[PDB]
Structure formats: C-alpha cells, structure tokens
C-alpha cells in the first residue's frame, strides 16, 4: 500500500527551458506529461542556488547553516539524518544513481552508483562511477547511462519492498556536450533573445556589475563555445576541451567535427565584434544547452514508459526538479548563485494520481527543504522535529491550493564568495509579490523588487519613498524568518 518514490533531478535545468512553464525555447513532452497528469508548482525555490548545497538541503530538509554544506568546497557529514536513511529504516529499498556531488560515501542507500569524474561533476562521455564501493567505467553517454542504471536497479529490486530512487542527471551542466544523436541539431535554429540580454545593470547594485558569469566575457572559446578543430586539439593534448572530447568514440568525434565546422568558420571569419558577437555567442550557448536538454526529456520518457510497463506508474510518486534554475542569457548571464528569479526558482512537477488532481497548479511558496518531509509523510514515517521544511501533502491533496497557515516567504542564503563566478554572499526573502536581498560580503547593499510590476528584476526599489512602509514590513518578516530558521548570525560576524 505504501507508495514508491522516484525523485528525478537535473543539474542546471530551468523553467524557461520547459514547455509546461510556458517556455518558447523547447518542447519537453515527457516533463510536460508529469505536469499534465499531476501538479506544477510555480513558486518553489532553492534555499542556496548551488549544486552541492541544494543536494544537501534535499536530503536533510534543512538549510545550509544546519546541514553543514554551505558551498561546493564542503564535505557532507554523512552521519547526519537524511530521508533515505529514515525510509530504509521503514522498510524501503533505497537507491542513488548519478550526480552525488557531496564528496563523502553515500549512507542510507541499499545501492548507489555516483559520478566520480571531474571532482564529482561527472563526465558526459564514458563516465567514471563509484558504485557500491568500487570504481567502474561505463561506456556511452551519461544521460542515457544513468537511465539504464536506474532501470536496471528497478528490474533487480526486492519486489516485496517499496522503492525510493534518487535519479540525478549531469545534464544540462556546463560545458553542454549533447548526445551523439543531437549533435548539430540546432545549427540552423535561431532562438529568441531575452529582452535583457544586453543589461547594463541600471537599477541594480554592485553585485550584478561585479560578477564573472557573462555571455560577453566569461564563456570561453574552447571549453564552452567548442571553437577548436581536431587538428588544433591534437597539437596540445593538455587542452581542457580535448580532455572531454577525447572521451567520445571515434564516430562521435567525427560527427562533432561536422557539427561544429560551421561555428568554427563563422568565428574564424573575424567579422563578429561587440553586440553582434554577444548575440552570436548567445545562439551558440543556447544551441548547445538546449540540445543537451533533449536527451534528458527523452530519458524521462523511457522511465515513465518502463514504470507503466511494470504496472508501477500510479503507485509511484514521480517528482521532476533541477538542483537550481539557470540563466539563459537573462541579464547577460549564464549560471546561478544569485537570488534572482531565473535561478532561485526550481521547476517542480509531481505525479501521483491517488493524491494529486491532474492538471493542478500551485502558487504555494515552497522550498527544496520541503522534499524530505513530503516523502516521509507519504511513506507514513513520522517527520522528525529537526527538519526545517514542511510536507507539501496539504497542498498536493487540495488541487494545489495554499493553506491558510502556509509560510509567507521563502528564505535564501548564498555563501560561495570569493569563488568562481564572483557572486557576492547574500541572504533574503521572497514573498508572494516581493523580494528583499542583502548582499553582505564583500559589499553591504540591499535590493528590493516588486515582482508583479518588475518580474524581470530590473528596478531596485530599496529606499524609494513610495515603498517605505512595504520595506519595513519586509524587513520585519526577514528578521522573523531568520529567527524561525535559526540563521542567527546571517552576516557571519560572530
Ligand atoms: O568551467 S566549469 O568547470 O565548467 N565551471 C563550472 C561553473 O560554471 C559552475 O558554476 C560550477 C558549479 O556548478 S554546480 O551546478 O555544480 O553548482 O561548476 C563548474 O566549476
Ligand atoms: Ca547545478
């Protein structure tokens, strides 16, 4: 009678690249099936928009200052409480397959197979895995391999125990190497630009101006844009693009070279400069990012079809999300980290027909700390008091409606600075209609956005007289929220 769980999570996917979220860029039919047969959350947020921290928050139901894992230079204390351990005590068989990114050996999993290359980022081709204590190499393409490993786990499971499987893809993380069948697929496709692709940061503070995550300056010609021929790579085999290209089979290298020849010729013509060059880089980025997404959605389909074939689709809570969202050129950026909406907001779609009316939507403000208590609640396990999120069951079971007692803000705290991409440390709250942010290291600057009037977050209204009352109310809610979640020294002074 207890439901199975499959928790499907990508790395750096985002709502703009999902058709169920009204995106124009790509159709995602299998993700959309989950939404159309289930519920779509419009206001689910990561509490620290970085991979390792998000994964730690998901396992523990706790904010980063409680779970210990504040940045991608942390090691997860595996002795702490996590939902898979609790499910395993309750009689579930548990599995972890794909991107782990928590460094310590997984605990609470009957079976685990985790990407070990690139310091646990994984490789796209011929990925290394650490699997139940041993190193292996899997031939092929990661997005497909991870799905085959998931199916193999399910085929070989103890069919007298319910299962909980965490299925964690590498795609679509940088540097966006598509599957062989998708190489070159968007070479003749032009994607619409966001209206703020050329953002000059008027109306923002120092943090937006001082980042290093731009289309214009940060994307590299080799690793990101793929602008080397085979001949060029073979002359310098220490090249980082070559380090990942060389993992592809010969026939895939041939297809890659054919797929990128046009792009290389366009770059070598030497006529692209300034805004035109930024626009061209944007197209190349989107073509690679979106081509990489295609295999993710195909593989979700394979899992949905497998579950249906074995008669377990309706008896399984099916979740799809991404560790955080991602900038697809908005504000001129790629990457995450900021509390801005594109990357703070996680996709969250859930199918479970017993509980969830098909085609439901929710605006209930939800966080990645809510996943753990939701799974424990549906598994009939008492939710321990130290979990900081809340079960989503009351939302799920009432067509997505927001309970009267539901929280009024999502809380956010990002720590990783100085570091890659140079995003200042900050914390804040997102209410239904507003956002309040404090950047506190190595600047001291507040920002505030009216999300209904300014959904693209272009106009910092902090300190503007007409918002004085609202600003005070948001300050007060921020302080209450910090106290509630025990973030007692949020500026890290003591
Ligand atoms: O040149 S790369 O090495 O590709 N650079 C990427 C960054 O662009 C990315 O922000 C981090 C963290 O990403 S996370 O999703 O793991 O948090 O991972 C790598 O270091
Ligand atoms: Ca990520």
Curated annotation (Swiss-Prot):
Record-listed 3-oxoalanine (Ser) modification sites: 51
Mitochondrion in keyword set: no
Pfam families (alphabetical): Phosphodiest, SGSH_C
Entry-linked CDD domains: G6S_like
Family annotation (Gene3D superfamilies): Alkaline Phosphatase, subunit A (3.40.720.10)
PTM: The conversion to 3-oxoalanine (also known as C-formylglycine, FGly), of a serine or cysteine residue in prokaryotes and of a cysteine residue in eukaryotes, is critical for catalytic activity.
E.C. numbers: 3.1.6.-
InterPro entries, alphabetized: Alkaline_phosphatase_core_sf, Phosphodiest/P_Trfase, SGSH_C, Sulfatase_CS
Keywords: Hydrolase
Domain of life: Bacteria
Alphabetized GO MF terms: hydrolase activity
Entry function: Exosulfatase involved in the degradation of the glycosaminoglycan (GAG) heparan sulfate (HS). Catalyzes the hydrolysis of the 6-sulfate groups of the N-acetyl-D-glucosamine 6-sulfate units. GAG-specific sulfatases play a key role in the persistence of the major human gut symbiont B.thetaiotaomicron in the host gastrointestinal tract.
Family label: Belongs to the sulfatase family.
Name of the protein in its database record: N-acetylglucosamine-6-O-sulfatase
Native species: Bacteroides thetaiotaomicron (strain ATCC 29148 / DSM 2079 / JCM 5827 / CCUG 10774 / NCTC 10582 / VPI-5482 / E50)
Origin organism lineage: Bacteria, Pseudomonadati, Bacteroidota, Bacteroidia, Bacteroidales
